[PDB]
Amino acid sequence: MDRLDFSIKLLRKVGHLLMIHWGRVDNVEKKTGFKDIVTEIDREAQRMIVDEIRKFFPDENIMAEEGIFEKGDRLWIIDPIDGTINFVHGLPNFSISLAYVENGEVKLGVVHAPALNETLYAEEGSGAFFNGERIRVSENASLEECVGSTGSYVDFTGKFIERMEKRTRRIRILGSAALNAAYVGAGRVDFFVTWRINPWDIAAGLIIVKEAGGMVTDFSGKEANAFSKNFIFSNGLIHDEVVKVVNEVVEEIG
């Protein structure tokens, strides 16, 4: 609809800005932390997205990973570049994420991968889409036929792949959280695990997976909410299995 179409068009527009500097970034500093990085393109992409929202939705709030941090019953969650590292290195797996939350709940989410021309999205009650076509989670009911995936987390990823690679086809590490979550919704992977990360980071992939028919919970199997920190996105069919094994990795890591 209105807000959704606006988002798709907006992220595709800004997506071209990132394409100009893709792989050719000069200023790269380690943002809030030490593991990840951030660039001047990050903020410039955010500024472009933020100016447009404020333009058509003046009385509404915004919340970026770095910079703007507001709260309201009409809130936009922006992540100018998810997979900054990939972006900087020239890997195509990076995306722009945008979610619209109203009255505390996610009403719609969009994830756009400039270099892959992949715009995945969904608005609650309307299903999940991918560049115009409907997407649904997979029907792979057992791990022997599943391709899972996870993020790069110290002490977690290695031991997680350690235990999982044995019971699945493959485990992928792509480098863009939002996209990977949307991929479960697209049905390209059967599950996606992401440890100790910011909750607002995946508001867009969450609604996409849920509208795609998937299941999203914390490492406890409990419905994923704004107070969860670890997330598990799946096709709902092999969730229990993934959850069990995830606690087996978190335990082993003390």
Added chain:
Amino acid sequence: MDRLDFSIKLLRKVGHLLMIHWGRVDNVEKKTGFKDIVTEIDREAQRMIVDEIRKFFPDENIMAEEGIFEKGDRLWIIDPIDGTINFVHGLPNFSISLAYVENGEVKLGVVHAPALNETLYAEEGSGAFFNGERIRVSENASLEECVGSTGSYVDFTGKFIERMEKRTRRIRILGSAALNAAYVGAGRVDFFVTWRINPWDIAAGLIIVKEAGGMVTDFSGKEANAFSKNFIFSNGLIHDEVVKVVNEVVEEIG
């Protein structure tokens, strides 16, 4: 050129055949286990390539992942679909690989990813390209500032990440050995490690990374060629450090 131009065009043509079935493969068969598959599309794609080569180079030899394993002074090495599992699940990381080997040494190599429209290639003595433009390995001299990558091998993977994770920036597991290797010569990743592997998964990757200024040796450090069972591709500035961790991991196993 003649053989290079021929190879680029042939792979691009066959790539469309694969696009038709991408993510919509009805039946997949387990070659040796559930982690090792192949499809009838692999076969149809190879046949298209084989038939074309036979037509213009009738007396030359052809060697493929399956079906044809000829030997000779003039040999063409084929991998119809490098990343079959990704291909079946609908992930974009899969490619067609071709290489012309003359007297044991690979003269030209072409790696084509249909979903991503990425054709990387190199001819002996002519440099490495990416869809017409020149590519060269990264200039990252420190492992900390590197993004390495590897395949999904049971036991070795979990261990490799485990070790490498505290030494690098990120480690990726995309799914296509040929592409993953060519990605090194593209400067998208700083190194790539392969455990247990055939010539058709890396003949094209060696020449690309080599003509792109990088290094390719077995796990011991010996400059390998057609095969060696173990491979390490890199920009050459951190090859030793990677070989160090690799031997650690492999010994930590045994």
Added chain:
Amino acid sequence: MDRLDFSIKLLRKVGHLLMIHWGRVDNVEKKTGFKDIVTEIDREAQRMIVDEIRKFFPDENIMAEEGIFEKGDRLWIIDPIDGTINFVHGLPNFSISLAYVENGEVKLGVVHAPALNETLYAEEGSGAFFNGERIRVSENASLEECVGSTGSYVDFTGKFIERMEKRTRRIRILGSAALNAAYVGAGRVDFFVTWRINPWDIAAGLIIVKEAGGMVTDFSGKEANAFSKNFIFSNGLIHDEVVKVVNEVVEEIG
């Protein structure tokens, strides 16, 4: 919904088949008569579509296999290739279209240009889209500021341009009616005129233009349908003026 999604996916799939031969037709065929090979591609593309419609909509008339009824019937129109000349010569302006018609009314239409990665479409009542995002006809209400289009038709084209020449900004001849019609609903051109063509070749574009807010009438100015004898697609703002010149041109000729 069900039909529209079915159609978007089916065409995006079959379009890849056309991409195999696209411009790959050797001159031995273009010289002897590319009519044959083109028909083999046409036949094969139609076969794949027909086979699928049979599986999902078993009791619906496909391309008049069960007659031609301007009222009281359910029909599926298939155009495997529109812009055949462009296709043969290697021009990217060619497409594949599918349209479902009920009682002479186009309920939904899809135009897919494989080489441009453009999927335009519309369902009756839901508006027109372009790869997931909404499209609408332009708002240029003065012929002198419009970009028009027509086909390379004998007699008609030379004159149509003579006229339009000073009355309008630019006139384009793309060589792809369906794509061209759709481009009107996308607001890329302000009006498109067709001289002596198969109505079923632009039925998909018909619904696309109307749902995008424009209008489509025959030369006599009557709203057009899938059986009309002539076509004029516009943004609905300068439609009367084009009909005028069109008829003037028709007078001059025959």
Added chain:
Amino acid sequence: MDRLDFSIKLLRKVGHLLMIHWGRVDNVEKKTGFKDIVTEIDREAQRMIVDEIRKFFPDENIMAEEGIFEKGDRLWIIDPIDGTINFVHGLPNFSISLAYVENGEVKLGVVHAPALNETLYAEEGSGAFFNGERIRVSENASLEECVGSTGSYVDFTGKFIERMEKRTRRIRILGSAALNAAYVGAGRVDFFVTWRINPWDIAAGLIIVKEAGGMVTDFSGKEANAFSKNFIFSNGLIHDEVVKVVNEVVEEIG
């Protein structure tokens, strides 16, 4: 090589800048000087191209399209947007052209269509390419088997279509002189006719057609050079037939 690889990469980079605004000069900012916003995109793009050239080839002349008429040994001819009308309307047929001239002769040429991902180029003595593969002029020997092209020129286009229509297979009017001339070297069109356009805006195309084995002369039939005003690009198999037909049009005019 150095200059050609730098140009290919440079045009591909700036191309995304154009994409950000492609078809994005809507009515809300169309009623607020849109021919000015397109001049900002142009100047901004021109600025990027100019800066990079100066940064790598410092003491070399730069005759930007909307720049100055410098003179010297080494000269770079730039055109930020060729096909401005299409660009403004959302049509994909627009390009960025760059030609490098030394000693008065064009040494290399690049034509990049951002919206189509088409990079056509050639180096004197190295032939023509299209995203890495070799391209060559068509092999059509008679006009009745050719698809010709020209632009939209008042008093000329009409008559041209008139006289050409009954001698040729089909004529096209796409809207981008450089892209269109390049398409002759790619073999998509058998010939192209421009009417009173500055040689500079067509220099990149000229080297592409010639390295592709084509023919480019002025309306008289003599080699095309800076003293030319009207051009004819062809495969060299039907050049004379075209010159003959074009001259008849020229007669009908005045």
